[PDB]
Design a protein around this ligand. Structure first.
Ligand SMILES: Nc1ccn([C@@H]2O[C@H](COP(=O)(O)O)[C@@H](O)[C@H]2O)c(=O)n1
Length: 124
């Protein structure tokens, strides 16, 4: 279908912009990245840093993932991110999201060879 690494890039990377522009940023990106195609994905984070900088997190601070696995890594520094959260009124297929732009550390799960990000765990 799509490799685990390519799925993570499509769902979470937005290196083209340095930050969310408007309050309509999530509504647009969630659709263009096809995250509202069968349902409205409730939460989704987009990272505004280069792909190389995001893949480097895999060799930074090892921490437990929310599920208890230990292949999660936190960035040593803060990164520009956009948190997208479904609104209380939102109803598929008319998905509506609330956009929050912020600078935070990210936590990702990595796997493979090369060892790259395959899952977005959280923003701290
Ligand atoms: N801060 C967060 C928390 C979760 N997520 C996304 O939400 C999805 C489900 O998250 P949980 O597994 O934490 O419920 C993850 O697959 C990840 O893509 C996110 O993108 N940003």
């Amino acid at each position: 279908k799509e490799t685990a690494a390519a799925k993570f890039e499509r769902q979470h990377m937005d290196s083209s912009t340095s930050a969310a522009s408007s309050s309509n940023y999530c509504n647009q990106m969630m659709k263009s990245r096809n995250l509202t195609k069968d349902r409205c994905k409730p939460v989704n984070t987009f990272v505004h840093e280069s792909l190389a900088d995001v893949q480097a997190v895999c060799s930074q601070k090892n921490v437990a993932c929310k599920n208890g696995q230990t292949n999660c890594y936190q960035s040593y520094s803060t990164m520009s991110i956009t948190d997208c959260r479904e609104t209380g009124s939102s109803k598929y297929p008319n998905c509506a999201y609330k956009t929050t732009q912020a600078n935070k550390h990210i936590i990702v799960a990595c796997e493979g060879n090369p060892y790259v990000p395959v899952h977005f765990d959280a923003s701290v």
